[PDB]
């Protein structure tokens, strides 16, 4: 039943007595459900260290991973180039999922095509799909460039992307000069960030490999900036803002900020902004190339060092205070531009915020996860805040990365109780926040089910989630935020301290019970 003046959606509609009785009857009559005492018993067992030991012995089963597959990252990279259509050679189900996954996070259109390889192509290859696909895409959506990656079915059957594209141009399906960079992006190797590295390196080679005789390092007086897999609009914007403030010439190579933030003004714009093909052709003439996320840009690094002859600086992701300092001093040294007063002031206002908030942050214990560069930058900033990053989980991390993070933890008293986990997932992490409970989680939306699990054990065991990372589906417009530079560090700090105070306010809101500490001033 409904009252037309106060209509109820599923919550709280189904808490009406008649729905509750109907659900009880369905369960008792036909579901043959385990008894509630048995469910409670098994739940309590899944919170124990005994269960955790069994949990960490898993070799074949993955539960709630914290990573996606390569072609997702290839799409995001391709989206950052001007009037470019990402094109995934292979089966079409992938592209539906790619577009939806990014739709949900950015709340924006996400343009991407497939060449719809089906049953027949497994036996005879996808050559004809590429010929008709490139031609159809070119004529229908009129991009200036098509950036080709692969689904896993096309990887397994061994389709030669290079030959298929060359034959498409030979047979006249698309003009010979029409740009079609490509990258093999197998879903069963690495993760989404690997797809980004592969796609970018493929675009770099396409516009540069056979033209190096013309290039002189430094002749265009700019610095190349390679963002890597990046899903915060504020991170593209903050980098271009700081470099402009310094008066540094730069090229941001893969820049999707415009396409992922078009205005709603009455017209849909399939393409907007983005790195131009020319910026790619001219990138070898830069002073140097800086990798914002080096731990998933290994293949790109070898190309810019091996072919462009740039001496890529050893720089961490510019997150937190120290690493933003080192980033700006490296950019200053390469460009000869002094760090301006405006950035020195901004640095000091971040430091000022750290002194204002350090008493609430001190000793706070966090479980966190995400991609390798993001995770280590968050770990670094947490230690600078005097917090303890107790559980550090990177499903797609590697051994060399873990060594680096472990050495970062060892350089601080606040890393004494921290452990770095690679190859582990959110079901592993569920156990860690039960057996060695932190104060908060910092992670993506999938973290919400861990918070729900902790609350089921008891309010005193609930671990609240703080949403920083990718994907974030259950809050709106957090993709506009910033996590890099002083700006991003100021945002993270403010998010952290106020999550702490909001939880404190919840725990002290009880009248005559806990509200003696319900302070007006904190």
């Amino acid at each position: 039943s409904q009252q037309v003046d106060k209509i109820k959606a599923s919550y709280p509609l189904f808490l009406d007595q008649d729905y509750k009785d109907m659900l009880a009857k369905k369960r008792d009559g036909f579901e043959e459900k385990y008894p509630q005492d048995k469910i409670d018993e098994v739940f309590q067992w899944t919170t124990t260290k005994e269960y955790q030991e069994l949990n960490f012995q898993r070799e074949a089963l993955t539960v709630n991973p914290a990573k996606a597959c390569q072609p997702l990252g290839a799409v995001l990279c391709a989206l950052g180039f001007e009037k470019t259509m990402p094109y995934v050679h292979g089966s079409q189900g992938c592209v539906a999922y790619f577009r939806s996954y990014f739709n949900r996070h950015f709340r924006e259109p996400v343009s991407c095509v497939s060449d719809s390889m089906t049953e027949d192509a497994a036996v005879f290859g996808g050559q004809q799909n590429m010929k008709d696909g490139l031609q159809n895409c070119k004529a229908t959506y009129k991009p200036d460039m098509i950036a080709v990656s692969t689904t896993c079915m096309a990887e397994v059957i061994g389709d030669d992307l290079n030959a298929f594209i060359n034959n498409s141009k030979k047979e006249g399906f698309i003009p010979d000069e029409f740009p079609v960079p490509f990258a093999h992006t197998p879903a069963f190797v690495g993760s989404h960030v690997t797809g980004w590295d592969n796609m970018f390196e493929g675009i770099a080679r396409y516009f540069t490999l056979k033209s190096m005789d013309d290039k002189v390092v430094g002749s265009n007086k700019k610095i190349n900036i390679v963002p890597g897999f990046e899903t915060y609009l504020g991170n593209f914007r903050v980098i271009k803002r700081m470099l402009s403030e310094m008066g540094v010439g730069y090229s941001l190579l893969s820049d999707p900020e415009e396409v992922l933030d078009t205005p709603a003004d009455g017209q849909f714009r399939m393409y907007a902004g983005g790195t131009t093909q020319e910026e790619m052709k001219d990138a070898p003439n830069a002073l140097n190339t800086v990798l914002l996320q080096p731990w998933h840009l290994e293949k790109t690094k070898k190309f810019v060092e091996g072919t462009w002859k740039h001496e890529v600086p050893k720089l961490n992701i510019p997150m937190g205070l120290d690493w933003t300092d080192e980033f700006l001093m490296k950019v200053s040294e390469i460009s000869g531009q002094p760090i301006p007063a405006s950035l020195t002031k901004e640095r000091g206002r971040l430091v000022d915020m750290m002194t204002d908030s350090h008493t609430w942050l001190h000793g706070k214990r966090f479980a966190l996860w995400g991609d390798p560069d993001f995770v280590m930058g968050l770990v670094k900033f947490l230690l600078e805040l005097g917090c303890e990053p107790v559980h550090i989980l990177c499903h797609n991390g590697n051994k060399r990365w873990k060594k680096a993070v472990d050495a970062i933890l060892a350089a601080s008293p606040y890393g004494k109780n921290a452990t770095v986990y690679i190859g582990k997932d959110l079901w592993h992490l569920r156990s860690l926040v039960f057996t060695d409970k932190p104060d908060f989680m910092i992670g993506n939306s999938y973290g919400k089910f861990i918070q729900r699990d902790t609350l089921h054990k008891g309010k005193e065991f609930e671990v609240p989630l703080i949403r920083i990372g990718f994907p974030i589906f259950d809050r709106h417009h957090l993709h506009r935020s910033t996590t890099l530079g002083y700006e991003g560090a100021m945002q993270i700090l403010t998010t952290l301290v106020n999550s702490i105070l909001e939880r404190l306010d919840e725990e002290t809101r009880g009248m005559q019970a806990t509200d003696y500490n319900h302070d007006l001033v904190r």
């Binding site: 949990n55 898993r58 189900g93 089910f449």
Partner: protein, 472 residues
């Protein structure tokens, strides 16, 4: 509108395609006037940005995923299972991670070693790990992703052997994304998997005490509670709903379904296969119904009641009399706010025709509709609901849908997440007609109230008058 103006539209839009695509797409666009109008269920033309998914989405996403006390393995690389984790709102009651598992992502996370050596022994070790860490699971399905078939794995062999070893129902599903042309073949593959591996379990068991009013809801995936809002009406009418396929469904409910007296089919497209099978093997008849809007829901309740006896037919009129003041207040409030507004729809295999009556109950007109993956029997059923000279599009391309919207200028568009933000930027109100835009239920009388307030809140929202800056 003019039939002449709609046909000129189609011609103009098709003039962008190369000849081969133009000749194919021409057959998938038509103006309404049974059969000899449009073709469907064909391969997608490459590079045209179809909205379709794959067979895995059709098997794991829609049919098997909702089954709440089983654990469904996304078997292959890490991709498919992650993008589809908790993306469809197939609601359920359970203790997730303990006795229910719908919103979790179980996967074999294929690495290159698995592509080269095969994944069958990984699957076996994974099944053992599932048993130790999730002991209350009541069965396991193995949802094949693209590589499984290409590499020559045999999940059937692993299922039989491990199933006998552990006395467990382990269902192999060869729903690899390269099969078929859309999610549609995934429904079929999944239907046959239920048949071959689950549905016969209790063929020879007679412990279940049956009644003449035993019924099963076939093809309701309980989006936002849709099936709960349907079950309550059927049972207020005197029926006993033994099972729900697949929304909030348990394995035992499915195993009990061959004992019912009548199969109530909501989604014909996804479930007609298993309904025809149960009619052949068990003699259980099935019928189609529609719980969208008061007109259709009332029509359906009376049609279902006519299959039983006078006592059910009497309770039918009692249920109709009970909810009459409720939906009449909904219409009285929201119809004047939506009267004469025009809607364009693009959805999957059922809703592009099934919701038309609910729109007409609010004085709205559906000037265009189409399906991602429907077959020609779906379009046959669509000719009747749609008015003449309306636009039909099968497997519409992103380009076509934008061009159709630009000319027709509907007041409201109802489609999916990949379409939503496109048309909101063009200044056309949009409602998601898959996920209900995180709202719903839309089924039944209780769902119609939510449907109505949702269409009004978006269509008449103040944000739509602000798209153009006052300085241009």
């Amino acid at each position: 509108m003019s039939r002449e103006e709609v046909e000129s539209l189609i011609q103009e839009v098709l003039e962008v395609y190369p000849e081969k695509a133009r000749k194919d797409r021409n057959k998938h666009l038509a103006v309404n006037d049974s059969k000899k109008c449009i073709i469907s269920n064909k391969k997608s033309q490459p590079g045209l940005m179809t909205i379709r998914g794959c067979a895995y989405a059709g098997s794991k996403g829609v049919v098997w995923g909702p089954i709440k006390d089983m654990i469904h393995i996304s078997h292959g690389p890490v991709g498919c299972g992650q993008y589809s984790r908790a993306g469809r709102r197939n609601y359920y009651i359970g203790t997730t991670g303990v006795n229910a598992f719908v919103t979790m992502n179980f996967t074999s996370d294929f690495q290159e070693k698995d592509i080269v050596f095969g994944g069958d022994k990984k699957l076996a070790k994974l099944i053992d790990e599932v048993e130790t860490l999730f002991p209350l699971n009541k069965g396991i399905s193995v949802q094949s992703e693209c590589p499984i078939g290409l590499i020559g794995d045999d999940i059937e062999s692993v299922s039989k052997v491990k199933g006998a070893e552990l006395s467990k129902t382990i269902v192999p599903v060869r729903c690899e994304g390269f099969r078929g042309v859309s999610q549609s073949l995934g429904h079929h593959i999944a239907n046959d998997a239920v048949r071959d591996w689950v549905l016969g379990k209790r063929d020879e068991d007679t412990t279940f005490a049956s009644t003449p009013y035993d019924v099963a809801i076939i093809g309701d995936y309980n989006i936002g509670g849709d099936a709960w809002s349907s079950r309550i009406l059927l049972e207020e009418m005197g029926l006993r709903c033994v099972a729900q396929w697949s929304g909030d469904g348990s394995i035992s409910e499915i195993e009990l379904t061959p004992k019912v007296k009548l199969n109530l089919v909501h989604c014909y497209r996804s479930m007609n296969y298993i309904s025809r099978h149960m009619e052949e093997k068990y003699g259980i008849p099935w019928m189609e119904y529609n719980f969208f809007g008061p007109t259709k829901t009332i029509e359906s309740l009376r049609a279902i009641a006519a299959k039983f006896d006078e006592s059910i037919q009497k309770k039918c009129e009692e249920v109709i009399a009970k909810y009459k003041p409720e939906w009449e207040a909904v219409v009285a409030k929201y119809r004047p706010r939506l009267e004469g507004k025009r809607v364009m729809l693009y959805i999957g295999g059922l809703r592009p025709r099934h919701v038309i009556g609910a729109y007409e109950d609010l004085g709205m007109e559906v000037v265009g509709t189409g399906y991602e993956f429907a077959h020609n029997d779906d379009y046959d059923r669509t000719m009747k609901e749609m008015g003449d000279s309306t636009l039909l599009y099968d497997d519409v391309t992103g380009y076509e849908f934008e061009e159709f919207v630009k000319r027709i200028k509907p007041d409201l568009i109802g489609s999916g997440i990949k379409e939503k933000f496109i048309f909101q930027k063009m200044g056309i109100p949009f409602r998601e007609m898959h996920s209900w835009d995180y709202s719903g239920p839309y089924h039944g009388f209780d769902g119609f109230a939510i449907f109505a307030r949702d269409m009004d809140m978006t269509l008449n929202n103040p944000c739509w008058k602000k798209l153009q800056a006052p300085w241009e």
